[PDB]
């Protein structure tokens, strides 16, 4: 039957990251940024949780390390599709490696979009989370 | 002022065009307009003689 | 209705004429006047005059606080066109139809 979505229901949450492992932690973080889990869960949003994770870096590698290259081919074509390996990957942009997992499953242009918006982390150690002064739910 | 043709009499098959929705009437080009084609009988005439 | 500023069969032109009124409406005779008058390009007087009758119809048989007559609602209309034909190599018929313009602009009181 019916059952229409509430109203401005805001919830954030702090994720460890560190120590946890690559992909799987992603699957999680992932669906986590639901839109389906708390009532009136669906198209127009719902949870997804304004979720933020730290120690984003210090993640455990799927035992692969090297042999996993992200790309950035803005490329003025016949340029470079810039191949890069997880190592340096993180070295400068770890929060991002995870990122690629994240987007990895995050879908829908405008929507998913907005979700990455409510999806933030910092391979910073945590202090970043601190910067995100607000509530600090957790797992 | 009433006695409409009894049973069926009145126009029975002056079916117009080819089909309510659609329409076209027959085969392929071989029977176009100026197409009153190989009339009565081709090989049948062979018989004839 | 109010101060009617409109007229028929004068072969000026659509778009352009529309531009003029575009800029002149809003304000009143005072301002839109100054613009219609000292701003360059055709239409100038066609427009201005249409203004004039508008205003006359106005303080004449509508009257209203003359001074505050300001163009209220307005813009233009083009009727038929002269269908002229020119030459364009290996003969061929090159056609054109100049716009015989009519203006639908009204002066409103406020």
């Amino acid at each position: 039957k019916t059952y229409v979505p509430k109203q401005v229901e805001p919830r954030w949450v702090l994720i460890d990251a560190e120590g946890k492992t690559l992909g799987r932690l992603a699957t999680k973080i992932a669906t986590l940024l639901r839109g389906k889990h708390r009532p009136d869960w669906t198209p127009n949003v719902a949870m997804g949780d304004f979720v933020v994770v730290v120690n984003a870096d210090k993640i455990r590698v799927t035992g692969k390390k090297l042999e996993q290259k992200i790309y950035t081919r803005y490329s003025g074509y016949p340029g470079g599709l810039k191949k890069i390996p997880l190592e340096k990957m993180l070295a400068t942009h770890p929060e991002r490696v995870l990122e690629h997992a994240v987007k990895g499953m995050l879908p829908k242009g405008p929507l998913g979009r907005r979700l990455f918006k409510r999806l933030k982390v910092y391979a910073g150690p945590d202090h970043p989370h601190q910067a995100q002064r607000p509530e600090k739910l957790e797992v | 002022l009433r006695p409409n043709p009894g049973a069926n009499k009145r126009r029975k098959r002056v079916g117009r065009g080819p089909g309510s929705g659609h329409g076209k009437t027959a085969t392929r080009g071989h029977k176009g307009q100026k197409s009153r084609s190989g009339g009565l009988k081709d090989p049948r005439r062979f018989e004839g003689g | 209705m109010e101060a009617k500023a409109i007229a028929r069969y004068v072969r000026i032109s659509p778009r352009k004429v529309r531009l003029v009124v575009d800029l002149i409406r809003g304000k009143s005779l005072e301002e839109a006047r100054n613009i219609l008058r000292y701003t360059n390009k055709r239409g100038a007087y066609f427009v201005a005059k249409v203004l004039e009758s508008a205003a006359a119809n106005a303080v004449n048989n509508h009257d209203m606080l003359e001074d505050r007559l300001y163009v209220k609602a307005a813009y233009v209309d083009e009727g038929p066109a002269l269908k002229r034909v020119l030459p364009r190599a290996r003969g061929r018929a090159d056609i054109i139809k100049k716009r015989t313009s009519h203006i639908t602009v009204i002066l409103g009181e406020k």
Binding site: K1, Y3, K36, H37, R38, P39, W41, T42 | - | -
Partner: protein, 117 residues
């Protein structure tokens, strides 16, 4: 003799005028392609009322999963639960209740976990 079908078609067509709601500029008054665009819309609503079923299928699917699991165990589990479940096993509401009567779900649950065993 005569036959100015006019009367007729002017009509058939305005009919069409309406047929055409006020679609995307041009496929709007688009007589022809208007009509077309319509045939489209037609087969469309087709597909539409057709599958809205599965649409809900999912709808609830998740709403509920949401709750059953939120609680203790997903579909294989919970579902199977209402399954073993006796003179009581309904669906087009599991959601509903999960929602409306928090208790309602909490226990439909309780028993259900047991329902399985």
């Amino acid at each position: 003799p005569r036959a100015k079908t006019g009367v007729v078609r002017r009509r058939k067509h305005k009919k069409i005028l309406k047929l055409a709601k006020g679609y995307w500029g041009l496929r709007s008054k688009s007589f022809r392609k208007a009509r077309e665009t319509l045939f489209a819309a037609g087969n469309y609503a087709y597909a539409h009322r057709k599958r809205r079923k599965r649409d809900f299928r999912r709808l609830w699917i998740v709403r509920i999963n949401a709750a059953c699991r939120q609680h203790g165990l997903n579909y294989s589990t919970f579902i199977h639960g209402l399954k073993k479940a006796g003179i009581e096993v309904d669906r087009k509401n599991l959601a509903d209740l999960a929602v409306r009567e928090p208790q309602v779900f909490a226990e439909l649950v309780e028993r259900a976990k047991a329902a399985q065993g």
